[PDB]
């Protein structure tokens, strides 16, 4: 079907042929020790040769040593095939989905992105390996156990094998008419229950016209015709095992008379009887598996063709080439309008917001709907509809990817924290571009020393989760730490005020009013601290900034600044 | 069984016994079918006498023919006790729940009530008499199967049952370690599946940061480390079953050994070693299918105490000591206060109306608020909780509830009509006091003749459901011609329908005029037509009659009637 996964597996075909090799060998140690039974039964015990019944214990046991030492060796080749063939699946996945665009990663699938190299990238091989198993185990013993009848009598073989077909038809002959009527039957059972639930549904007509005595004797014959519709569903449910019984015993009976009394037979003398009826039987189960190879084939490959639409999708947009090394200017919008994939109603209307040099702009307004979507734009983690974006007089579609992604600081609350040590987070990606000798410094000018020092080992401690955990406070320390050591000229203040606590508002305010230098900032606004403080006061409510003057001649005027300060009150 | 359930079986246990006579020959003829084994291999095939051969195919199908007809005649004649001891109880059930009182069939239950008498009536004896066809079936098998096998080599057959604890207990001790360490390993397991999921979370910060090369070789070492974790749960899987397939073949070559003495190869030969050994492996379904004859007689017993319940349950408060002929006087309604049964908000404050003799009252509200419950409280479908209702100067507590509901008519829209043909469905449950005589003037009064007259056979004809399906202006007026024909004297004209129609509204509107003659009535009111013509005019404010005045009276003041109207336009 895909067989595009074909060249992952051809690095490692060396545990596919010693387990086609060491499995073999576990269903040809299946086929002799079947074999035992004629001797045993031939010179064995039926004889008084003694000395057929001394060496067989011994392989008895000699032959399901050979059945577990192959059992085992075609494990240890089938988990190393099928797991370095999950691995380097498992890790290509996990290189495509950290470069594409955080709309996938955004609503379009949240908690299902592990089940596909977790669960769905070991099905492509627990189902794909478990379908050559079976067709290679169950296609030997299948071989074995047509061998030893032919070789040890052919005649009852072939007489014995025209048969199989004979029987298994006239067995599903037999059983489709039993099957239909009983379909039939159930119909009418069905019809005489529903004429019941009709009955039942007027008890509060029954009560007033005083109709309990004949209302009751009229369920002396809807129960009547509930038995005899119910005991005519057994008697022709019951008649249909003893028929197909008798049918595939005739076959026996046949056998039975033909293979003594024709001078054809009689080649056979206890043991060649017992091990061509006995291998027969053990003909079914490699027969009722080998059905489902394809059954399975296809069931563990259609998470491979989910995997392949996963992998090898649109990658992020990384359009232009121009290189921006410092943003020694204003980032700036104007007249830009964008809507978030996957919905139709504008989430971001005509807007034009100019972040001037050495300032900041406050976003304010708790509309809820305006004020991170434009944080989410300077980043480009969702690409604008139409209009431009403005960086130091060229647009953000130009620039690099990379060398717009490292101008931008988000300084915001909910901030991940990844499993390292207590340094490497304030450096992440950047360890050998910035000493140690810097990292004090971050961490001292960031009032993060104290938390440092009261830990268990110091400046190493591993603090992402599955680790140490934080508070809010701290982590906003450490961003806040990330941010003053990269040194990016533009930061973006989610500032959630989560708590206005004592101790801890003195702490984070003292950080970001040390952040904030001469860096230009756009800070989403939630609480009046900074709004009071900021030099261009912006409303974004529905993406119409309309009240858009400055602090001071908003506050006079009675406009959504006023009405902010009257809400808080 | 359950010592409430016997003395409905016992009148038919002769079928029970018939029934435990022909199940045991149905395996005591499986038990002789394995021991043709020893005429074929030892004087048959072996011995190549070539007339044990001739004789034995008559054999196999003169034992499956009286494995047949032991399977089905103790297949019906258990299908004759388990079809007719559910019977008897269907029509117990149905016999307590059509006078038990209505707050049973209200949200008490639904139309899960026929799953009590179709599907939990059946329960009782498809599972146990499913627990009497494995305790004699399989339990004679076994007695036959332990004489075979002692018969046949006693010597082999202590030696043979004498390891068949310690295998067992063996292939258990070597599952259990096996298992709890696999259990092990696969909580191991998630400590390295929660840390890559603690990857996929930081995307909007692996991007902004750059590190895509820092976190990729941070997946090229979490996906080794569940790899070589998933190499060692499969490599702990992988060697339990190898090792106790390797105890259960130490018994076997064991019991090949032990064969070996002088003492045991003196009567073991060809066969009486193949019917020793293979009864062994047909010993296991029986005792298989034995295990759960104590799990099946409490499932199908189970059902026995729910159905019971309902069977002992509390049925109407018939509190039967004063009988009257007729009503010929007054309904009233004195400090009347009832809550639904099941809540706690009163639906029912005080009342006080009287039902004028030769006059009609109308609960003209639109506000639902619980004036069908007025209606309800008159044929005591719900009980009072505290007040007096008056029926001719005396409680309705006192008078026969088979005399009360015999002077209430109840001329709805949802009237149920009988399975019957139109003729006793107009005369239910008195149709031997009226003969046709006076059902046809009943027709004839009621203006529905025309509806009779123009259908096929004429006033015999099905009626109900799954029948003709009548309309609903034909349901009502078969309503009207029943209330007529009964000559009431009360009646409660629901008049749920306000809908206007020609031919419709005109001969319903006739129908009823007809109908309140005299015939002292309250209306539920959803009709102008009805309340401009209302005697007395009386709205439900929530449990309080507040407005007990006249049409005219409530007419001039806005009051709640006049507010009706303000609505009705």
Not at 68 to 79: A, E, L, N, Q
Not at 332 to 342: H, L
Not at 411 to 432: C, G, K, M, P, W
Request: charged share 20%.
């Amino acid at each position: 079907t895909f067989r595009r996964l074909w060249p992952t597996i051809a690095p490692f075909k060396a545990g596919l042929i010693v387990a086609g090799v060491a499995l073999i060998l576990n269903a040809a140690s299946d086929t002799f020790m079947l074999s035992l039974l004629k001797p045993l039964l031939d010179d064995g015990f039926g004889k008084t040769d003694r000395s057929v019944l001394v060496w067989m214990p011994l392989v008895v046991i000699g032959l399901m040593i050979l059945r577990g030492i192959t059992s085992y060796v075609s494990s240890y080749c089938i988990s190393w095939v099928s797991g370095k063939v999950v691995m380097t699946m498992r890790r290509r996945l996990f290189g495509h989905m950290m470069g594409m665009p955080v709309s996938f990663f955004d609503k379009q699938s949240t908690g299902t992105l592990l089940s596909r190299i977790t669960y769905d990238s070991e099905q492509v091989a627990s189902s794909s390996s478990g379908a050559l198993i079976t067709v290679v185990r169950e296609g030997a013993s299948i071989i074995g156990l047509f061998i030893m009848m032919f070789y040890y009598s052919w005649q009852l073989s072939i007489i014995l094998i025209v048969l199989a077909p004979i029987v298994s038809i006239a067995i599903r002959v037999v059983s489709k008419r039993f099957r239909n009527i009983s379909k039939n039957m159930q119909n009418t059972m069905g019809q005489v229950t529903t004429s019941a639930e009709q009955m039942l549904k007027g008890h509060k007509e029954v009560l007033i016209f005083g109709g309990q005595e004949v209302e009751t004797k009229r369920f002396d014959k809807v129960s009547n015709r509930m038995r005899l519709q119910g005991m005519k569903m057994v008697s022709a449910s019951s008649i249909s095992d003893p028929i197909i019984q008798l049918i595939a015993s005739l076959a026996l009976a046949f056998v039975l008379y033909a293979a003594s009394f024709p001078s054809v037979m009689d080649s056979l003398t206890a043991g060649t009887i017992t091990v061509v009826f006995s291998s027969m039987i053990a003909l079914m189960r490699p027969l009722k598996s080998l059905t489902n190879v394809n059954a399975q084939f296809q069931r563990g490959m259609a998470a491979c063709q989910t995997l392949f639409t996963i992998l090898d999708s649109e990658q992020e947009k990384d359009e232009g080439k121009r290189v921006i090394e410092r943003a020694t200017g204003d980032v700036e919008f104007r007249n830009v309008t964008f809507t978030y994939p996957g919905r139709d109603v504008p989430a971001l209307r005509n807007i034009n917001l100019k972040i001037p040099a050495g300032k900041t702009v406050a976003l304010v307004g708790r509309s809820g709907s305006g004020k991170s979507t434009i944080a989410s734009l300077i980043t480009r983690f969702y690409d604008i509809d139409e209009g431009e974006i403005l960086m130091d007089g060229h647009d953000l579609r130009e620039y690099t990817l990379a060398s717009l992604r490292n101008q931008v600081a988000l300084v915001s609350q909910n901030v991940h924290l990844f499993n390292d040590t207590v340094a490497n987070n304030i450096a992440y990606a950047r360890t050998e571009q910035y000493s140690r000798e810097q990292i004090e410094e971050a961490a001292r000018m960031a009032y993060a020393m104290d938390f440092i020092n009261k830990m268990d080992n110091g400046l190493d401690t591993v603090i992402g989760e599955n680790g140490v955990l934080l508070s809010g406070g701290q982590r906003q320390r450490i961003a806040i730490a990330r941010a003053l050591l990269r040194d990016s000229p533009i930061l973006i203040l989610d500032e959630a005020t989560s708590a206005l606590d004592t101790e801890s508002e003195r702490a984070i305010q003292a950080a970001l009013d040390e952040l904030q230098k001469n860096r230009t900032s756009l800070v989403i606004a939630h609480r009046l601290s900074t709004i009071e403080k900021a030099d261009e006061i912006v409303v974004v409510e529905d993406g119409v900034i309309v009240e858009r003057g400055t602090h001071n001649d908003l506050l006079e005027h009675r406009g959504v600044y006023a009405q902010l300060h009257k809400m808080q009150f």
